[PDB]
Design an enzyme around this catalytic site. Sequence first.
Site, mmCIF file in Angstrom:
data_model
loop_
_atom_site.group_PDB
_atom_site.id
_atom_site.type_symbol
_atom_site.label_atom_id
_atom_site.label_comp_id
_atom_site.label_asym_id
_atom_site.label_seq_id
_atom_site.Cartn_x
_atom_site.Cartn_y
_atom_site.Cartn_z
ATOM 1 N N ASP B 25 0.817 -1.204 0.000
ATOM 2 C CA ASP B 25 0.000 0.000 0.000
ATOM 3 C C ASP B 25 0.860 1.266 0.000
ATOM 4 O O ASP B 25 1.253 1.763 1.058
ATOM 5 C CB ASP B 25 -0.914 -0.010 1.223
ATOM 6 C CG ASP B 25 -2.018 1.041 1.147
ATOM 7 O OD1 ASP B 25 -1.940 1.937 0.308
ATOM 8 O OD2 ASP B 25 -2.950 0.998 1.960
ATOM 9 N N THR B 26 1.159 1.791 -1.193
ATOM 10 C CA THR B 26 1.986 2.993 -1.296
ATOM 11 C C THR B 26 1.328 4.225 -0.643
ATOM 12 O O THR B 26 1.995 5.224 -0.409
ATOM 13 C CB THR B 26 2.368 3.313 -2.777
ATOM 14 O OG1 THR B 26 1.193 3.420 -3.599
ATOM 15 C CG2 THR B 26 3.260 2.254 -3.323
ATOM 16 N N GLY B 27 0.021 4.149 -0.380
ATOM 17 C CA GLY B 27 -0.728 5.250 0.173
ATOM 18 C C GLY B 27 -0.849 5.250 1.685
ATOM 19 O O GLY B 27 -1.477 6.150 2.261
#
Lengths: 99, 99
Positions: B25-27
């Site tokens: 999850d880059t966010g």
Amino acid sequence: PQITLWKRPIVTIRIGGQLKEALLDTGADDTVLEEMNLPGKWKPKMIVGIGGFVKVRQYDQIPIEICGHKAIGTVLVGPTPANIIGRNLLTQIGCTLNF
Amino acid sequence: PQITLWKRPIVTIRIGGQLKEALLDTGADDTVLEEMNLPGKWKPKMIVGIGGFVKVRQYDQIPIEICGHKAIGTVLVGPTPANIIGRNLLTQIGCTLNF
Ligand SMILES: CC(C)CN(C[C@@H](O)[C@H](Cc1ccccc1)NC(=O)O[C@H]1CCOC1)S(=O)(=O)c1ccc(N)cc1
């Protein structure tokens, strides 16, 4: 480009003739932008995050550009604390995770 | 590996001698796992997601392996709908986004 992850992967996007900043978010199925205006017809949608369900408006076939990459996609608008570019557009522009 | 994004970037992780599935999850600034018991002592923390604020437990220096890559880091545990591997670990194992 290559985007590193020690800071938030914030990029410049273009929508509705305006430039904005948005988070490239592999953990989001869909793209959600903070409250704004977009033209034409929208359906209500429910998304789930941490903290629970959020009601947003879904706009279809919205012209958008993400770091110079042009696309037409679905864009949800509603109360998010951050502009978020989700997998619907990330896949379109050829984004992968690499390690 | 290279992980594509037309499906959820779900991978196998190891923590506490068990294998689980988690979303890359880059966010997510931080790594949050669904309720589980982990060794030792923990500080409460608040995180914000799309549906608001969530109280979690922070465990520091937790041994973890993400898709074959070993690390020791901070891991939060709380009511999340999905196991998520955030930027704290993604950067450690050398993840980038590329398009
Ligand atoms: C919960 C995950 C599985 C899905 N979320 C994506 C996540 O990347 C989410 C993105 C975000 C960034 C900034 C503020 C609020 C949310 N970060 C997140 O929760 O930050 C927490 C996790 C640890 O550290 C803090 S989502 O926002 O709910 C989401 C869901 C569906 C769609 N279509 C769009 C967005």
